[model samples]
Target: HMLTIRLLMHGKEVGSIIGKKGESVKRIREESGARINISEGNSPERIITLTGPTNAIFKAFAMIIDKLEEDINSSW
Candidate 1:
Protein backbone atom coordinates (compact mmCIF):
# COMPACT_ATOMS: atom_id res chain seq x y z
CA HIS A 1 0.00 0.00 0.00
CA MET A 2 1.05 3.55 -0.63
CA LEU A 3 1.52 5.85 2.32
CA THR A 4 2.41 9.41 3.11
CA ILE A 5 3.78 10.85 6.29
CA ARG A 6 3.98 14.50 7.23
CA LEU A 7 6.28 15.83 9.89
CA LEU A 8 6.68 19.26 11.44
CA MET A 9 10.19 20.14 12.51
CA HIS A 10 12.01 23.17 13.88
CA GLY A 11 14.78 24.91 12.01
CA LYS A 12 17.57 23.10 13.80
CA GLU A 13 16.09 19.67 13.22
CA VAL A 14 15.38 20.56 9.63
CA GLY A 15 18.97 21.65 9.21
CA SER A 16 20.20 18.34 10.54
CA ILE A 17 17.93 16.37 8.25
CA ILE A 18 18.70 18.37 5.15
CA GLY A 19 22.43 18.34 5.91
CA LYS A 20 25.07 20.22 3.90
CA LYS A 21 23.84 20.89 0.33
CA GLY A 22 20.97 18.45 0.98
CA GLU A 23 23.24 15.45 0.78
CA SER A 24 21.58 13.83 3.77
CA VAL A 25 18.10 14.10 2.33
CA LYS A 26 19.34 12.99 -1.05
CA ARG A 27 20.80 9.84 0.43
CA ILE A 28 17.68 9.08 2.39
CA ARG A 29 15.53 9.46 -0.68
CA GLU A 30 17.81 7.31 -2.77
CA GLU A 31 18.23 4.52 -0.28
CA SER A 32 14.69 4.48 0.98
CA GLY A 33 13.05 4.94 -2.41
CA ALA A 34 10.79 7.50 -0.81
CA ARG A 35 9.99 10.91 -2.17
CA ILE A 36 10.78 13.55 0.42
CA ASN A 37 9.59 17.09 0.02
CA ILE A 38 10.52 19.89 2.37
CA SER A 39 8.82 23.22 2.57
CA GLU A 40 10.94 25.98 1.11
CA GLY A 41 11.65 29.54 2.31
CA ASN A 42 13.03 30.81 5.60
CA SER A 43 10.30 29.60 7.85
CA PRO A 44 11.21 28.70 11.40
CA GLU A 45 8.93 25.72 11.21
CA ARG A 46 8.97 23.49 8.17
CA ILE A 47 7.06 20.51 6.93
CA ILE A 48 8.68 17.36 5.60
CA THR A 49 6.40 15.16 3.57
CA LEU A 50 7.23 11.59 2.66
CA THR A 51 5.39 9.56 0.05
CA GLY A 52 5.97 5.99 -1.00
CA PRO A 53 5.09 2.38 -0.35
CA THR A 54 4.79 1.23 3.28
CA ASN A 55 8.16 -0.46 3.18
CA ALA A 56 9.78 2.57 1.67
CA ILE A 57 8.17 4.82 4.25
CA PHE A 58 9.58 2.67 7.03
CA LYS A 59 13.01 2.72 5.51
CA ALA A 60 12.94 6.49 5.31
CA PHE A 61 11.90 6.73 8.93
CA ALA A 62 14.74 4.45 9.94
CA MET A 63 17.29 6.59 8.12
CA ILE A 64 15.89 9.79 9.56
CA ILE A 65 16.01 8.40 13.09
CA ASP A 66 19.60 7.37 12.62
CA LYS A 67 20.51 10.87 11.48
CA LEU A 68 18.65 12.47 14.33
CA GLU A 69 20.40 10.22 16.83
CA GLU A 70 23.78 11.25 15.53
CA ASP A 71 22.85 14.91 15.73
CA ILE A 72 21.70 14.58 19.34
CA ASN A 73 24.67 12.58 20.54
CA SER A 74 27.20 14.81 18.85
CA SER A 75 25.80 17.97 20.40
CA TRP A 76 23.78 17.00 23.43
Candidate 2:
Protein backbone atom coordinates (compact mmCIF):
# COMPACT_ATOMS: atom_id res chain seq x y z
CA HIS A 1 0.00 0.00 0.00
CA MET A 2 2.95 2.28 0.42
CA LEU A 3 6.52 2.79 -0.67
CA THR A 4 9.19 3.41 1.92
CA ILE A 5 12.55 5.14 1.66
CA ARG A 6 15.18 4.82 4.34
CA LEU A 7 18.16 7.16 4.50
CA LEU A 8 20.98 7.24 6.99
CA MET A 9 22.95 10.36 7.72
CA HIS A 10 25.35 11.56 10.35
CA GLY A 11 23.72 12.94 13.48
CA LYS A 12 25.39 16.29 13.09
CA GLU A 13 24.20 16.82 9.52
CA VAL A 14 20.72 15.73 10.52
CA GLY A 15 20.08 19.02 12.22
CA SER A 16 20.84 21.06 9.12
CA ILE A 17 18.87 18.75 6.88
CA ILE A 18 15.94 18.65 9.28
CA GLY A 19 16.02 22.35 10.20
CA LYS A 20 14.84 23.73 13.52
CA LYS A 21 11.97 21.91 15.16
CA GLY A 22 11.56 19.77 12.04
CA GLU A 23 10.33 22.62 9.86
CA SER A 24 12.20 21.21 6.90
CA VAL A 25 10.68 17.79 7.28
CA LYS A 26 7.26 19.29 7.75
CA ARG A 27 7.60 21.24 4.56
CA ILE A 28 8.62 18.20 2.63
CA ARG A 29 5.72 16.17 3.99
CA GLU A 30 3.23 18.89 3.17
CA GLU A 31 4.60 19.52 -0.28
CA SER A 32 4.89 15.88 -1.27
CA GLY A 33 2.11 14.31 0.80
CA ALA A 34 4.54 11.74 2.04
CA ARG A 35 4.74 10.46 5.59
CA ILE A 36 8.15 11.19 7.05
CA ASN A 37 9.56 9.83 10.28
CA ILE A 38 12.89 10.35 12.01
CA SER A 39 14.27 7.70 14.29
CA GLU A 40 16.50 8.33 17.23
CA GLY A 41 19.01 5.76 18.30
CA ASN A 42 22.47 5.22 19.74
CA SER A 43 24.23 4.47 16.46
CA PRO A 44 25.11 8.10 15.75
CA GLU A 45 23.06 7.94 12.58
CA ARG A 46 19.75 9.50 11.77
CA ILE A 47 17.23 7.43 9.91
CA ILE A 48 14.82 9.24 7.66
CA THR A 49 11.77 7.27 6.71
CA LEU A 50 9.39 8.29 3.97
CA THR A 51 6.23 6.43 3.11
CA GLY A 52 3.47 7.08 0.61
CA PRO A 53 2.20 6.09 -2.78
CA THR A 54 5.00 4.87 -5.00
CA ASN A 55 4.91 7.84 -7.33
CA ALA A 56 4.66 10.35 -4.52
CA ILE A 57 7.50 8.72 -2.60
CA PHE A 58 9.64 8.82 -5.72
CA LYS A 59 8.90 12.49 -6.17
CA ALA A 60 9.74 13.16 -2.54
CA PHE A 61 12.99 11.27 -2.90
CA ALA A 62 13.96 13.37 -5.91
CA MET A 63 13.12 16.53 -4.07
CA ILE A 64 15.16 15.49 -1.05
CA ILE A 65 18.15 14.74 -3.26
CA ASP A 66 17.68 18.00 -5.08
CA LYS A 67 17.79 19.86 -1.80
CA LEU A 68 20.96 18.04 -0.80
CA GLU A 69 22.57 18.85 -4.13
CA GLU A 70 21.62 22.48 -3.76
CA ASP A 71 23.19 22.57 -0.33
CA ILE A 72 26.35 21.02 -1.67
CA ASN A 73 26.55 23.48 -4.54
CA SER A 74 25.93 26.47 -2.31
CA SER A 75 28.49 25.36 0.25
CA TRP A 76 31.33 25.76 -2.25
Candidate 3:
Protein backbone atom coordinates (compact mmCIF):
# COMPACT_ATOMS: atom_id res chain seq x y z
CA HIS A 1 0.00 0.00 0.00
CA MET A 2 1.02 3.56 -0.66
CA LEU A 3 1.24 6.39 1.79
CA THR A 4 -1.02 9.38 1.32
CA ILE A 5 -1.40 12.65 3.14
CA ARG A 6 -3.93 15.44 2.85
CA LEU A 7 -3.32 18.82 4.40
CA LEU A 8 -6.01 21.36 5.10
CA MET A 9 -4.62 24.87 4.77
CA HIS A 10 -5.57 28.40 3.88
CA GLY A 11 -5.05 29.97 0.51
CA LYS A 12 -2.28 32.21 1.71
CA GLU A 13 -0.35 29.29 3.15
CA VAL A 14 -0.95 27.35 -0.01
CA GLY A 15 0.49 30.21 -2.01
CA SER A 16 3.55 30.15 0.23
CA ILE A 17 4.22 26.48 -0.52
CA ILE A 18 3.42 26.93 -4.19
CA GLY A 19 6.09 29.62 -4.26
CA LYS A 20 7.13 31.85 -7.15
CA LYS A 21 6.13 30.43 -10.52
CA GLY A 22 5.51 27.05 -8.81
CA GLU A 23 9.17 26.57 -8.12
CA SER A 24 8.76 25.37 -4.55
CA VAL A 25 6.22 22.71 -5.41
CA LYS A 26 8.24 21.66 -8.42
CA ARG A 27 11.22 21.14 -6.20
CA ILE A 28 9.19 19.09 -3.74
CA ARG A 29 7.93 16.84 -6.49
CA GLU A 30 11.34 16.36 -8.00
CA GLU A 31 13.09 15.73 -4.73
CA SER A 32 10.46 13.47 -3.18
CA GLY A 33 9.27 11.67 -6.28
CA ALA A 34 5.73 11.73 -4.93
CA ARG A 35 2.40 12.49 -6.53
CA ILE A 36 1.01 15.78 -5.30
CA ASN A 37 -2.11 17.76 -6.10
CA ILE A 38 -3.85 20.80 -4.65
CA SER A 39 -7.59 21.09 -4.64
CA GLU A 40 -9.06 23.96 -6.65
CA GLY A 41 -11.94 26.47 -6.40
CA ASN A 42 -12.66 29.79 -4.73
CA SER A 43 -12.35 29.11 -1.04
CA PRO A 44 -10.60 30.23 2.11
CA GLU A 45 -8.82 26.90 2.43
CA ARG A 46 -8.01 23.84 0.38
CA ILE A 47 -6.57 20.34 0.45
CA ILE A 48 -3.11 19.29 -0.67
CA THR A 49 -2.77 15.61 -1.42
CA LEU A 50 0.53 13.75 -1.44
CA THR A 51 0.73 10.07 -2.21
CA GLY A 52 3.45 7.58 -3.06
CA PRO A 53 5.86 5.09 -1.53
CA THR A 54 6.39 5.29 2.21
CA ASN A 55 9.83 6.85 1.97
CA ALA A 56 8.74 9.37 -0.63
CA ILE A 57 5.68 10.35 1.37
CA PHE A 58 7.79 10.77 4.48
CA LYS A 59 10.27 12.92 2.62
CA ALA A 60 7.56 15.16 1.18
CA PHE A 61 5.81 15.44 4.53
CA ALA A 62 9.03 16.40 6.28
CA MET A 63 9.87 18.97 3.64
CA ILE A 64 6.46 20.62 3.96
CA ILE A 65 6.68 20.84 7.75
CA ASP A 66 10.18 22.24 7.49
CA LYS A 67 8.98 25.05 5.27
CA LEU A 68 6.09 25.77 7.58
CA GLU A 69 8.36 25.84 10.58
CA GLU A 70 10.66 28.26 8.86
CA ASP A 71 7.78 30.58 8.11
CA ILE A 72 6.54 30.43 11.67
CA ASN A 73 9.93 31.04 13.20
CA SER A 74 10.98 33.74 10.77
CA SER A 75 7.76 35.70 11.09
CA TRP A 76 8.05 35.95 14.82
lDDT of 3 by residue, 1-76 (tens): 6978899998777776777898988998899898989888758988999999988888888888777776763432
Decreasing TM-score order of the candidates = 1, 3, 2
Model 1, span 1-76: residue lDDT tens: 9989999987788888989999999999999999999999778999999999999999998999889889984555
Model 3 vs. true fold: TM: 0.85
Best by TM-score: 1
User: TM-score per candidate, in order?
Assistant: 0.91, 0.74, 0.85
lDDT (10s digit) by residue, model 2, range 1-76: 6878888876655665577797876777788888878787546888988899987788777777776766663432
Whichever of 1 and 2 has more TM-score, that candidate is 1
Give Cα-based local distance difference scores for all models. Answer: 0.90, 0.75, 0.83
Give the residue spans of candidate 3 off by over 4 A: 73-76
Which parts of model 1 are misplaced by more than 4 Å?
Answer: 73-76
Q: Rank by lDDT, highest first.
A: 1, 3, 2
**Clash tally, candidates in order:** 0, 0, 0
Report RMSD for candidate 3: 2.1
